[PDB]
Write a protein that binds this ligand. Structure first.
Ligand SMILES: Nc1nc2c(ncn2[C@@H]2O[C@H](COP(=O)(O)OP(=O)(O)O)[C@@H](O)[C@H]2O)c(=O)[nH]1
Ligand SMILES: [Mg+2]
Lengths: 76, 165
């Protein structure tokens, strides 16, 4: 029911997904405690269906359509 | 610069994440957001040495055991935290210290017993009870408030200092 997000610098967060929320909403609290900025970064969905390769996210993309996978966030 | 890998363990709700955030960002997190796992990295200066604190904040016991089980053989230093108003979390400490002694291999692993929420007036764990526990483990005990910041640097910097020994 969640999201396992890799952050910048070697920081992991996992996020419980409720509803309405974008990735901005479920993650903006995660970054800002880590002194980081949501519109300074890009977020991507990880597929090792090609061996370790990244699928790009809009920040207003859904939370729910991820509820069992793996993301990582990287300065834009 | 030297990296210190610190792990924060203890019952759900005792303030592991609030202690950490308070260390990291100087902010008290008054909301209760249970943790699955969070790791933070921060550059600090402790006794004149610029260093890196790698801090693994772990899941209370809400729930989520099947997660930190080598992520424990990676930790160099453990903060075992209970809240002074939550007797049950003090009684849980022992399980954590046993998990820790198991997943490493010694009864001298760098460790600190932290009694958090010492700003609350509903104390049910006396200082003396916690001091006895810590004495029997061979480690320091420190009372903390993530709200007010009492003891929070002391708690982390002490754990660093145990690690440097
Ligand atoms: N009064 C007080 N409340 C605290 C303290 N630390 C945490 N809390 C509150 O207790 C709840 C549990 O905090 P949290 O850090 O999520 O607990 P954790 O599950 O062990 O990480 C949250 O509401 C925190 O605001 C403290 O030192 N004093
Ligand atoms: Mg937590």
């Amino acid at each position: 029911n969640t999201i396992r997000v890799f952050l910048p610098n070697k920081q992991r967060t996992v996020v419980n997904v409720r509803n309405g929320m974008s990735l901005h909403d479920c993650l903006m609290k995660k970054l800002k405690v880590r002194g980081l900025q949501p519109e300074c970064c890009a977020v991507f969905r990880l597929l090792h269906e090609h061996k370790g390769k990244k699928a790009r996210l809009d920040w207003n993309t859904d939370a729910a359509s991820l509820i069992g996978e793996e993301l990582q966030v990287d300065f834009l | 610069m030297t990296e210190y890998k610190l792990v924060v363990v203890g019952a759900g709700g005792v303030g592991k994440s609030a202690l950490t955030i308070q260390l990291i960002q100087n902010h008290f997190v008054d909301e209760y957001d249970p943790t699955i796992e969070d790791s933070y990295r921060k550059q600090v200066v402790i006794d004149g040495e610029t260093c890196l604190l790698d801090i693994l904040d772990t899941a209370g016991q809400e729930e989520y055991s099947a997660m930190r089980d080598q992520y424990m053989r990676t930790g160099e230093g453990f903060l075992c935290v209970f809240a002074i108003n939550n007797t049950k979390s003090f009684e849980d400490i022992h399980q954590y210290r046993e998990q820790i002694k198991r997943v490493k291999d010694s009864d001298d692993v760098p460790m600190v017993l932290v009694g958090n929420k010492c700003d609350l007036a509903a104390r049910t764990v006396e200082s003396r009870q916690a001091q006895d526990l810590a004495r029997s483990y061979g480690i320091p005990y420190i009372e903390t408030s993530a709200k007010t910041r009492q003891g929070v640097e002391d708690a982390f910097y002490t754990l660093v200092r145990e690690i440097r020994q």
